[PDB]
C-alpha cells in the first residue's frame, strides 16, 4: 500500500493526465501542466492505454513517480517527455514481432536476431526476466544504428511480457564479456541504451551483471561509468565465475557454456514460423475485446476521478473506491491477456514454451 503523502502525489499525476484528456476532476482536495500543453489529447490517451499491457495503471505511473523521487512536477515532466517520444512506434515493434521484421526484410535487425546477440534466457532469483547479451558477437558494420536500436527496443519489450504477477516488473541484464575484443566495442549503442532506459523505461532495471570482463574493458569502463546515474551504477555487479552468478540466477537458467544447466541453442536461431498466429486475423473478435477494453478504461477513469476528489481517506465510501479501482485494474490486465493473441505476432519465446501472457 501507499502512504498518505504518496497517495497525494499519485492523485496529482492522474489529475494532470485527466486535465490533458478532458476527464472532469477536481484536484483541490488531496490549467493543463506545462509538460502536457504540447501533446494531442486523443493521441496521448489512446497510446497510453495501448501501452498498458500486463501492469496496472497505478504501477505504470508509480514507476515514473519513484524514478523522479516523488516530485510531482518532475514526474509529470518525464511522463510527458515519454508520451511525446513513444507515440505508437514501440507498440508496432512488439506487435509485429520478429515476423514483421522478416516479412519486410529488415536485414540489420535480422542479423541481430540470427546472431542471438540479445536473448531472453529465463528468470533471475527474484523472478525478473534475464536478457543475455554477448558483445563478442557485435560488429558496428552488421547494422545501422537505427536497426540496432529497433532490435534493442524489441528485445526490451519482449522481456516486459515475461513480468510475473507479484514480482518486480523489471529486467536483469547479463553482459557476457567472454571473447570481447575492441573489434566489438561500439560506444553509440551503449549511449542509446543508457539514454533510453533513463527516460523511457523508469524503474525497469533489476541487476546489471558484467561477467568475465577482460582487461581491455577497464578503460572503456572508465568512460561508461561517467555516463551513469547513481541508481543504475548501483545496479552493476562484476562477476568472474559461475559461483558468483549463482547468487543472482538459478543454475537452471544459466547457459551451459557459462557453467549452468540451460541447454538452449545459442549458436542456431529458430525464427517464429508463424503457426501460432491464427488469431491475428479474427478481426471481429479483436474488435469485441477492444470494446470491452474501451468500456473498462472509461469506468476506470470515472472511478479514479471519484477517488481523487473524495474526502476523507477513512471513509467506507473511500474503501469502496479503492477496491473498485483494484478490481478494474485487474479487469484491464485480464482484458489485455485476452487481447494479446489478437494483436501480437508470437515471439520465439511463445513457441519454445518460455513465454505465457
Ligand atoms: C537489449 C540490449 C541490452 C542489447 C542490444 C544489442 C546491443 C546493444 C549489444 C551490444 C553491446 C555492446 C556493443 C557492448 C560492448 C561492451 C560494453 C558493455 C558490456 C557495457 C555496456 C552496458 C552497460 C553496463 C551500460 C549501462 C547499462 C544499461 C543497460 C543502462
Curated annotation (Swiss-Prot):
Present with 9600 molecules/cell in log phase SD medium. This is Phosphatidylinositol transfer protein CSR1. It comes from Saccharomyces cerevisiae (strain ATCC 204508 / S288c) (Baker's yeast). Non-classical phosphatidylinositol (PtdIns) transfer protein (PITP), which exhibits PtdIns-binding/transfer activity in the absence of detectable PtdCho-binding/transfer activity. Activates SPO14/PLD1 (phospholipase D1) by stimulating phosphoinositide synthesis via the STT4 PtdIns 4-kinase. Modulates ArfGAP function through effects on SPO14 activity. Inhibits phosphatidylcholine degradation by PLB1 (phospholipase B1). May also regulate post-Golgi membrane-trafficking events and have a role resistance to oxidative stress. Signal peptide: none annotated. The lineage of its organism: Eukaryota, Fungi, Dikarya, Ascomycota, Saccharomycotina. Belongs to the PITP family. It is found in: Cytoplasm; Microsome; Endosome. Its main location: cytoplasm. Residues 106-266 form the CRAL-TRIO domain. Keywords: Acetylation, Cytoplasm, Endoplasmic reticulum, Endosome, Lipid degradation, Lipid metabolism, Lipid transport, Microsome, Phospholipid degradation, Phospholipid metabolism, Phosphoprotein, Transport.
